[PDB]
């Protein structure tokens, strides 16, 4: 394969109250750049395009990662800082609606499907290779990589879970839900910026010192 799932799995494994989420996000951003470098063909792309994809996708990329990490947790999510966030606190802080959607639409569904790490990595690779991210020098190039991920992931699903014919689709149908949830989380992050971290802040603006350095 041109986009082997093996290398995508390696990339996931190779990376192991209101403001606690923001702290965890700042750290995970560093890990994310390393994850993306491990994704087949990502570093072959022009540098400015690598930057564009990571600015466009980091949010959904991280939400998918902490959602899958939280499969064992019950009524909460496990941040990479080791901190656990419970339903009660989320509602206290006025962030309870979006939190319940994350559990209902992401965590729970990933649990009931027993979504595995390869499946996850492929979904995140798809999110990453977004040909609609603004200002790409070559959208086609990125579309083709996304489409290679479609092919590898369907193939993997047929081989490993042959009993489950609709499994490929079930995976892909988490992405709309993830996109809308992404939009709502970004909202909240924008509010925290307007009210009371360096890399995170660099990501929320339109100049990308830290991102440029980290991918060299």
């Amino acid at each position: 394969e041109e986009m082997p799932v093996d290398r995508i799995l390696e990339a996931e494994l190779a990376v192991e109250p209101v403001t606690n989420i923001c702290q965890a996000a700042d750290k995970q951003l560093f890990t994310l750049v390393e994850w993306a470098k491990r994704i087949p063909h990502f570093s072959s792309l022009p540098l400015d395009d690598q930057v564009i994809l990571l600015r466009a996708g980091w949010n959904e990329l991280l939400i998918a990662s902490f959602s899958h990490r939280s499969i064992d947790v019950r009524d909460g999510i496990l941040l990479a800082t080791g901190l656990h966030v419970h339903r009660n606190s989320a509602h206290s802080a006025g962030v309870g609606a979006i939190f319940d959607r994350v559990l209902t639409e992401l965590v729970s569904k990933m649990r009931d499907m027993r979504m595995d790490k390869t499946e996850l990595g492929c979904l995140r690779a798809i999110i990453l290779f977004n040909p609609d991210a603004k200002g790409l020098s070559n959208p086609s190039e990125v579309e083709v990589l996304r489409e290679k991920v479609y092919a590898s992931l369907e193939t993997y699903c047929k081989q490993k879970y042959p009993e489950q014919q609709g499994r490929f689709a079930k995976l892909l149908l988490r992405l709309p839900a993830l996109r809308s949830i992404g939009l709502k989380c970004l909202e909240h992050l924008f509010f925290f910026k307007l009210i009371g971290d360096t890399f995170l802040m660099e990501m929320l603006e339109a100049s990308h010192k830290i991102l440029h350095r980290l991918l060299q």
Binding site: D132, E154, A169, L173, L175, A177
Partner: protein, 244 residues
């Protein structure tokens, strides 16, 4: 590999239901404020607004004929239509895009370019994505069955705000996804990416739904007011329309 008779018959029903709903909308053509040949602006805005309304009515009649939809409770039916209407409006809009003229055709012969959309009061930040999405859908080369299926799937999205019985909605959605898999794998066996490419348009549509909110924001800024039906749907006329 295969299309069940049941699958074939369901797809036929959806395609038939769209055509039937198109005819109804076309009856309403002489009803629309005519396109002017500062109140020409106000007239174009009124004109566009009226087409949006007819589209919403068309979408409602269509949903009522989607097998399963009527078996849900009335508050879920409403919640699914509230959320999906703009998205389905966009799909139906793309479907009427002609790449040779770069125009969109509403009803029978209401042909509009980008500039026309601007003259009707929409902002560039909204118009551009609409035309980019229409181009993207044209590249896909979808047929009427595919469009109808993708609309059905879109309605039965369990994650919309205020869905009280999501398990029921996901179960309704599943056969429609399964039928679209079978249908596209038979239509173009040599192109295995057609199915996920379609499904991923559902993701695009969540973004476009969000660009639309930004358009509504701009309208308030300009003090343009929307008719009841559209204000309701985008923040009990919907209720009435379902009750008929």
């Amino acid at each position: 590999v295969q299309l069940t008779a049941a699958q074939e018959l369901m797809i036929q029903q959806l395609v038939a239901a769209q055509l039937q709903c198109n005819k109804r909308s076309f009856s309403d053509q002489p009803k629309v404020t005519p396109w002017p040949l500062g109140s020409a602006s106000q007239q174009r805005f009124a004109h566009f607004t009226e087409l949006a309304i007819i589209s919403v009515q068309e979408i409602v009649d269509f949903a009522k004929q989607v097998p399963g939809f009527l078996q849900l409770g009335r508050e879920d039916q409403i919640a699914l239509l509230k959320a999906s209407t703009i998205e389905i409006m966009l799909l139906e809009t793309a479907r009427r895009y002609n790449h040779e003229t770069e125009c969109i055709t509403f009803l029978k012969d209401f042909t509009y370019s980008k500039d026309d959309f601007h003259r009707a009061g929409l902002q560039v930040e909204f118009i551009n994505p609409i035309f980019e999405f229409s181009r993207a859908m044209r590249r896909l080369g979808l047929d009427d069955a595919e469009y109808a299926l993708l609309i059905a799937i879109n309605i039965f999205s369990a994650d919309r705000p205020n869905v009280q019985e999501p398990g029921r909605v996901e179960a309704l959605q599943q056969p429609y996804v399964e039928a679209l898999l079978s249908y596209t794998r038979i239509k173009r066996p040599q192109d295995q990416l057609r199915f996920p490419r379609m499904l991923m348009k559902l993701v695009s549509l969540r973004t476009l739904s969000s660009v639309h909110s930004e358009q509504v924001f701009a309208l308030r800024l300009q003090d343009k007011k929307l008719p009841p039906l559209l204000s309701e749907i985008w923040d009990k006329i919907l209720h009435r329309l379902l009750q008929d």
